[PDB]
Copies of this chain bind each other. A is one copy, B any other.
Amino acid sequence: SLIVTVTMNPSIDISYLLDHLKLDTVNRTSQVTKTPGGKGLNVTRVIHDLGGDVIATGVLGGFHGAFIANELKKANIPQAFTSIKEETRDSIAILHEGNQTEILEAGPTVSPEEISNFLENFDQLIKQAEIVTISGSLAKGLPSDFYQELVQKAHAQEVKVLLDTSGDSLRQVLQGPWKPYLIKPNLEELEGLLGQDFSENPLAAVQTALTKPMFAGIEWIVISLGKDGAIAKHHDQFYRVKIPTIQAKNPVGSGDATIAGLAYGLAKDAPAAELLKWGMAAGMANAQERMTGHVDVENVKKHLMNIQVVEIA
């Protein structure tokens, strides 16, 4: 069943491997990777790797956008981005001595007319979809509540929204009458929403938090806890998800991978326990890969066997 991903501020992700980062001087390297990035494209790639039926949308501009579209084509990832005039952004990640120093650009400005063009395209794509993922930053020009329009449209088409987003904005979706099917805030995200501190006995705190009016009407809530696995709520059932303590190279985007695994599970009508395993197993496989937004499916399937899902009273 068709999953649509949304990436409103896609990036050429540039990754530099450096022995040492010498400040105020020239650092040379031939250890460079340039990859389609932004959270929604990390998601897209993982779903694609899992064998899911995905199409990527969002906005792409200029030669940078054309580079991304061509990379997606070479990978045989179905895409249906909307064109904009301004250039798609670059993101820089510098890897040096265990450090990850990053530079994020604000990105291009999208015009009201381009926003209208994207929404028309979004309307057509979601007619054929079962699931939509919405995550990541908004390009400039987009109204701070852009994602709520997207949730409302999916609702009219009876499409399940996986919303992996944060802050004041996520709060405004949750405040409104059109609920996402699934949300996946991390602990700091959740602390931000509730204006609450969960540093002491986080597991017990999260279980209380998820009973709050904030979260009413959301079918699935999945809170990743890193090595502690997850706490989740489906309607009135709380779950604890316990995962093996694995050797975890690059954690960047294991959260985009979790969402991909969750979308993939939903797409195949996985029961609750299985759905939570696809999520955790994808996040796990991703962390064992240098490439962000990439898993090997055989290793995912392996991790599925060693995750425990526990119903909490």
Known: A63-B67, A90-B90. A26 touches B102 (CB 8 A): yes
- Integer count of this chain's copies in the complex: 2
Residues of B within 8 A of A25 (CB): 101-102
Residues of B within 8 A of A66 (CB): 63, 66
Residues of B within 8 A of A99 (CB): 23-24
Task: Check A268 for interface membership: any CB of B closer than 8 A.
Answer: no
Task: Check A64 for interface membership: any CB of B closer than 8 A.
Answer: yes
Residues of B within 8 A of A28 (CB): 103-104, 106
Q: Are A29 and B105 in contact (CB under 8 A)?
A: yes
Q: Which stretch of A13-21, A39-47, A281-289 is in the interface?
A: A13-21
Residues of B within 8 A of A24 (CB): 98-101
Partner of A30, one of B27, B90, B102, B105: B105
Partner of A106, one of B18, B29, B87, B102: B29
Q: Are B32 and A105 in contact (CB under 8 A)?
A: yes
**How far apart sit A29 and B100, CA to CA, in the bound complex (Å)?**
17
Q: Interface centre among A14, A29, A70, A103, by most B CB within 10 Å? A: A103
**How far apart sit A92 and B14, CA to CA, in the bound complex (Å)?**
10
**How far apart sit A115 and B70, CA to CA, in the bound complex (Å)?**
25
A positions within 8 Å CB-CB of B: 14, 16, 18, 21-30, 32, 34, 62-64, 66-67, 70, 87, 90, 92, 94, 98-106
Sample (28) of A-B pairs whose CB atoms are under 8 Å apart: A16-B92, A16-B103, A21-B23, A21-B101, A22-B101, A23-B101, A24-B98, A24-B100, A24-B101, A25-B101, A26-B102, A27-B101, A27-B102, A27-B103, A27-B104, A28-B104, A29-B103, A29-B104, A29-B106, A30-B106, A32-B106, A62-B67, A63-B64, A63-B67, A63-B70, A64-B67, A66-B66, A92-B92
Given pairs A22-B101, A63-B63, 12 additional interface contacts (CB within 8 A): A24-B100, A25-B101, A25-B102, A26-B102, A28-B103, A29-B103, A29-B105, A29-B106, A63-B67, A63-B70, A66-B66, A90-B90
Which 3 pairs across A and B sit closest by C-beta, in order of nearness? A30-B106, A63-B67, A24-B99
